[PDB]
């Protein structure tokens, strides 16, 4: 309106100048961003000091003038000053004032009709509060804690997105007139945008603040922290008030935020479709991609496309890995050998060929790596740090808490390193039928021995016996492991160390673009395998809710 005309007059006056004209004529609009920095540049070393030195003054604050006149804010209300007509040097349209005036505003100032919109602006923090209120605390106890360090998420968030997907969403919810071309994420996620817009429409608000809050509402704060007990964002947000190095405030927090259910459902779906595509023999790749794009699922209220969620999550499972590989989705440098988890710390190597006789004389090729390497390993409630050297398990240390888990981790580690005589001369029990090729698809002896172990516990015991056994020397009694998985014995296994206290999980902010074969075996710029279809449960029946398998 008249304001519009005033803006036009100001633009004209400004163009009358020469420098302003040159700068508003040359180049594109992006230069604006640059111009935003050369101006209003001033910092301070110890703001605390200068704040105590300024608030000791009469008028340490600036403020708008017309807003006060329109608000009828007087001066010298009860012999106490609030402001005086002046012009700050920087703004030139602001006037000095005192802190007391703010209280005046809060007490006898202009009131808006409603302000419940705030609860939507800062929904994350009200959610924190509510989650807290729905807790049932418990007794307090003192003891030592095995706090392991690791990378986790501290902010529960639904529909975790990227940044490119968020920047457009803010514009389409607040500044639509200034909106860019419609991106795919919008056309796909229409109802979401409609919801976010229904709330922040026809309201008196500062919009920059809203955009910042939305960024926080869609950011899972990832941190490398010490942790104990279960791992859930609902806990990590207040971990500080659950336990430390010497104390623990017990409390039950299981029935809140319904997060891990979504992840387990996703992984189940991935397993299902992976098996389906494996049923094929020559196009399992395209079959899997079709099954992917021909599928969707519901999240809370909205329906999202599978391929979209898969590229946003970070569940390092041998199922999600394959999918993210088919879709060309980059991922981290994390391995998987059956149920266990692995991560390489250092070392190198290269493939090498060798053979073994299954029964009598039956040559079967099996490969290994010819060098020294170091690996971290994590099984259920058990950690380990070991090294392989030329088809042998050089050393290993463990910091778990269970005997069964310890033994299983040790066995899977020995297998991963092809250590022992079994890889030199397999047992009689195995045969050519159990070898491979359920229907033609071969199987390396590694996973063969894997399933052979999972079959019977006695295979596992024999495998452990394959490792050298000796008499527990003095002093090392505590750092020793028997066959049952006991922290001490009179005779223990060879080249083993135990200790109380998990191992600190390594960290690396790296990404890699890998591929896979027609047999669903991924490769990473080398002959190394990061995932497959033999490392997942065989099969199981489940009834998926709120899903769409729109495929014949």
């Amino acid at each position: 309106m008249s304001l519009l005309l005033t803006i036009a007059k100001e633009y004209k006056r400004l163009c009358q100048d020469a420098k302003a004209a040159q700068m508003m004529t040359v180049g594109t609009v992006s230069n604006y961003t640059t111009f935003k920095k050369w101006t209003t540049s001033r910092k301070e070393k110890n703001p605390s000091l200068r704040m105590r030195w300024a608030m000791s003054s009469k008028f340490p604050i600036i403020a708008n003038k017309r807003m006060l006149e329109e608000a009828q804010i007087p001066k010298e209300h009860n012999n106490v000053a609030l402001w005086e007509d002046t012009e700050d040097v920087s703004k030139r349209d602001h006037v000095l004032a005192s802190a007391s005036c703010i209280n005046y505003w809060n007490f006898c100032g202009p009131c808006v009709n409603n302000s419940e919109v705030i609860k939507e602006v800062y929904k994350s923090r009200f959610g924190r509060l509510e989650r807290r209120k729905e807790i049932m605390w418990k007794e307090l106890r003192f003891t030592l804690v095995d706090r392991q360090r690791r990378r986790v998420d501290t902010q529960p968030v639904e529909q975790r997105l990227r940044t490119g997907e968020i920047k457009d969403l803010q514009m389409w919810t607040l500044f639509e007139d200034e909106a860019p071309l419609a991106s795919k994420f919008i056309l796909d996620n229409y109802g979401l945008v409609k919801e976010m817009r229904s709330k922040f429409a026809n309201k008196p608000l500062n919009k920059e603040v809203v955009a910042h809050m939305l960024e926080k509402q869609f950011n899972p704060e990832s941190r490398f922290l010490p942790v104990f007990g279960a791992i859930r964002p609902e806990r990590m947000e207040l971990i500080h008030a659950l336990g430390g190095e010497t104390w623990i405030q017990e409390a039950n927090t299981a029935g809140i935020s319904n997060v891990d259910q979504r992840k387990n459902d996703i992984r189940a779906v991935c397993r299902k479709v992976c098996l389906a595509a494996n049923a094929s023999i020559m196009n399992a790749k395209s079959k899997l991609v079709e099954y992917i794009k021909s599928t969707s699922m519901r999240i809370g209220e909205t329906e999202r496309k599978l391929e979209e969620l898969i590229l946003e999550t970070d569940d390092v499972s041998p199922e999600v890995t394959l999918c993210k590989s088919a879709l060309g989705g980059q991922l981290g440098k994390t391995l998987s050998f059956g149920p266990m988890l692995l991560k390489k710390i250092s070392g190198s190597g290269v493939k090498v060929k060798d053979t073994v006789y299954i029964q009598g004389v039956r040559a079967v090729q099996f490969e290994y790596w010819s060098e020294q390497e170091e690996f971290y390993g994590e099984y259920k409630s058990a950690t380990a740090l070991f090294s392989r050297k030329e088809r042998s398990l050089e050393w290993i240390t463990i910091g778990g808490g269970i005997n069964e888990d310890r033994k299983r981790l040790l066995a899977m580690c020995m297998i991963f390193c092809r250590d022992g005589d079994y890889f030199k001369d397999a047992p009689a029990t195995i045969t050519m039928a159990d070898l491979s090729t359920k229907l033609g698809r071969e199987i390396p002896y590694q996973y063969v021995m894997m399933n052979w172990i999972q079959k019977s516990e006695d295979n596992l015991e024999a495998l452990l016996y394959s490792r050298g056994i000796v008499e527990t020397n003095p002093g090392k009694m505590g750092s020793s492991m028997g066959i049952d998985g006991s922290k001490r014995a009179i005779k223990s296994l060879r080249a083993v160390t135990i200790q109380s206290g998990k191992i600190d999980m390594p960290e690396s902010k790296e990404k890699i673009h890998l591929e896979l074969s027609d047999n669903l075996e991924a490769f990473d710029s080398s002959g190394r395998i990061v995932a497959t279809i033999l490392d997942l449960p065989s099969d199981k029946k489940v009834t998926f809710q709120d899903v769409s398998f729109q495929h014949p």
Binding site: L4, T34, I503
Partner: protein, 712 residues
């Protein structure tokens, strides 16, 4: 009785009480003599006398690389390097990490150097302008350099870093440069020297090592190349495990613990380990940029022909750097009634009226000296290159030889800048000593010395690293962060939430105990109430704010919903540190107060932009200083005011300019005009506008367009 607190160190450990020694509960303490001594120590440490003459400046240039002489008291520092050993160590490190490593890192760097905008040079510590010859922030220096470029030949159309670098290069070959001032011009040689010039700052914000009492401040012609080198160095260091520079806190602890486990598992029964706490000396005075140049050339050998030329700039520039002497000497009479002040450029004149020490320290450095500057052809300075030196150091911990294995000896460790930790292993002390001497020698071959006093050793599990002492457990000093338990000094809303967040982080990482956290909370609350001159309502304090507080308090019915800055009490505790008070009281405030606070139309509210806080009337901005009001620093304010007007008008038109960075092929005037016409039509169609008003607006706009296009 006589008292002695140290007696508690007998029946108790030492780590769990080491915090008691740190006097971080009191104020910490705060030239040319320092700089001259530094220059002297730098020359002296190079253990040679060879020199050349620069055809450019015609100045003696001590060459200190592969010219070792004077092999006496080698225990003392030395700044000579043998490139061969450096390249060998680099090759060994690459071999360990695998092939295609350095190439991959330089590729990851080039992936960013190209797309980077030249406006990211505004962020960072102060710089030394080359026109006024003073230390201003980076933004203003960049602005002035761009304006000078434009006034000389033409406006800088560039939009990336590479074009800016090429422009700088060209500007090193010009013959007459212009720039604004109360509009002087200069020649080639003077501008060259004034560009390679470097200044010093006595900030040393952190206490840390009291020896650190200064820091460097290069110009603007050296910032982008330095950024390139730091980027490649970072991409390299992050891959390594024997480095802890970029990471902070839990990361290095986990590194050390895994290292210790690996060590204890590797060594056999006939071996024993040892630890060492090292603190290198003269780090920024022995590292040489010539070795850095050779090393970067060895790295950028298989990559593109572009990176080879960029990385090779900052090294030669630091190989031909000039230093700035500050404030000169002070003269006076006996009674000290009068007092004369003198500058550096004049000290060469009154060199006889000075103490014999200054004379012995100054006359030798009279040929290397030029007007208020010295031609230091080498050495280094603080903060310039940290990551590259860390890489150079880690190359040692990777060393291995046939002799070390013939005796079953090997070392590893972890190093940050001028601070490392060593883990030696052997079968007998006679071999431990030999191993340590070997390590010291290999470090001496690349200028990496070691302080014999601050360094000590012991059996495996007893050492320190960056104020963190290590044993079976981990002792959080807890005094390193004591100053953080203070109000930042931003506004009322924020400081409280920020303090609670800091307390939470301490409780999580630094093992801060509960009762201590509660005490710190109450203390920060008291300091907050005291700083902003505010107190509760139930209190009897008098003053400005409290007056109107007690006046209007009658209108309230539930004080539990009030804020601290408005006579409110504390409702927060350990279990509520991750929740601001504004959120915790929203459900009990009075609708009147609630609405008067959370109103977007406030004459005070300003946004700052981490900012995990709520916005309200209390989120104000402080007054601005006025000392400059008297100084004639006003001419510079003009261009800033112009840019500000332009930006705020553009924003008045486009509200999302700050959130979403603008983009497009249009200029600013074009977009403004089109958008204004669009809004005019949109309103006149339905909204309250007349054809007369629309036509007037259109006429004004076309006239403004004509004037804009006609002015130039």
């Amino acid at each position: 009785m006589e008292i002695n607190p140290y007696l508690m160190f007998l029946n108790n450990d030492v780590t769990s009480l080491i915090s008691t020694t740190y006097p971080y509960t009191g104020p910490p303490p705060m030239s040319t003599k320092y700089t001259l001594e530094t220059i002297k120590r730098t020359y002296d440490y190079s253990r040679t006398s060879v020199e050349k003459t620069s055809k450019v400046f015609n100045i003696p240039r001590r060459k200190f690389c592969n010219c070792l002489e004077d092999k006496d008291e080698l225990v003392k520092p030395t700044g000579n390097v043998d490139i061969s050993s450096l390249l060998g160590l680099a090759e060994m490190m690459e071999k360990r990490m695998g092939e295609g490593f350095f190439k991959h890192c330089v590729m990851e760097a080039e992936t960013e150097i190209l797309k980077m905008h030249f406006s990211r040079l505004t962020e960072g510590r102060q710089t030394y302008d080359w026109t006024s010859e003073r230390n201003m922030p980076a933004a203003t220096a960049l602005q002035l350099t761009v304006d000078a470029i434009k006034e000389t030949e033409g406006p800088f159309k560039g939009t990336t870093m590479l074009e800016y670098c090429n422009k700088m290069i060209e500007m090193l070959d010009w013959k007459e440069i212009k720039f604004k001032k109360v509009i002087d011009s200069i020649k080639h040689d003077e501008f060259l020297i004034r560009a390679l010039t470097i200044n010093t700052m006595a900030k040393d914000g952190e206490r840390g090592k009291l020896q650190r009492r200064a820091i460097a401040t290069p110009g603007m012609i050296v910032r982008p190349f330095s950024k390139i080198v730091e980027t490649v160095a970072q991409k390299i260091c992050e891959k390594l495990k024997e480095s802890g520079l970029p990471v902070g806190g839990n990361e290095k602890k986990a590194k050390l613990k895994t290292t210790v486990t690996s060590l204890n598992a590797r060594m056999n029964s006939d071996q024993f380990a040892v630890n060492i706490t090292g603190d290198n000396s003269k780090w920024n005075e022995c590292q040489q940029p010539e070795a850095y140049l050779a090393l970067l050339a060895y790295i950028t050998k298989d990559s593109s022909d572009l990176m080879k030329d960029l990385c090779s700039v900052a090294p030669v520039l630091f190989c031909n750097k000039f230093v700035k002497l500050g404030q000169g000497i002070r003269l006076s009479n006996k009674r000290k009634t009068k007092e004369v002040i003198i500058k550096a450029e004049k000290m060469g004149k009154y060199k006889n009226l000075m103490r014999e020490e200054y004379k012995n320290l100054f006359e030798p450095l009279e040929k290397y000296i030029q007007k208020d500057v010295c031609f230091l052809p080498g050495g280094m300075l603080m903060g310039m290159f940290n990551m590259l030196s860390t890489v150079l150091g880690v190359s040692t911990l990777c060393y291995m030889d046939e002799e070390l294995k013939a005796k079953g000896c090997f070392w590893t460790g972890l190093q940050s800048s001028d601070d490392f930790v060593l883990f030696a292993v052997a079968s007998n002390w006679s071999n431990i000593h030999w191993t340590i001497r070997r390590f010291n020698a290999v470090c001496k071959l690349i200028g990496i010395n070691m302080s014999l006093e601050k360094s000590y050793g012991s059996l495996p599990e007893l050492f320190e690293f960056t104020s963190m002492f290590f044993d079976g457990e981990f002792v959080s000093n807890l005094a390193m962060e004591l100053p953080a338990f203070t109000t930042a000094g931003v506004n009322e809303g924020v400081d409280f939430t920020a303090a609670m967040s800091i307390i939470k982080t301490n409780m999580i990482n630094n093992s801060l105990s509960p009762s201590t956290a509660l005490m710190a909370l109450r203390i920060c609350l008291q300091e907050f109430r005291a700083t902003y001159r505010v107190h509760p309502w139930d209190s009897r304090v008098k003053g400005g704010r409290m007056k109107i507080i007690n006046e209007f308090i009658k209108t309230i019915e539930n004080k539990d919903g009030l804020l601290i800055a408005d006579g409110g009490k504390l409702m927060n505790n350990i279990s509520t540190l991750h929740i601001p008070e504004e959120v915790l009281k929203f459900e009990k405030m009075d609708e009147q107060y609630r609405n008067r606070v959370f109103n977007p139309k406030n004459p005070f509210t300003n946004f700052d932009k981490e900012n995990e806080a709520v916005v309200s009337t209390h989120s104000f901005r402080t007054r601005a200083n006025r000392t400059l009001l008297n100084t004639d620093m006003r001419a510079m304010m003009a261009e800033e005011k112009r840019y500000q007007m332009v930006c705020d008008m553009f924003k008045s038109v486009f509200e999302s300019a700050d959130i979403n960075p603008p983009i497009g092929a249009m200029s600013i005037g074009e977009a403004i005009e089109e958008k204004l016409l669009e809004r005019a039509k949109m309103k006149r169609d339905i909204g309250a506008i007349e054809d007369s008003e629309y036509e007037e607006i259109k006429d004004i706009i076309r006239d403004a367009k004509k004037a804009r296009l006609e002015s130039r």
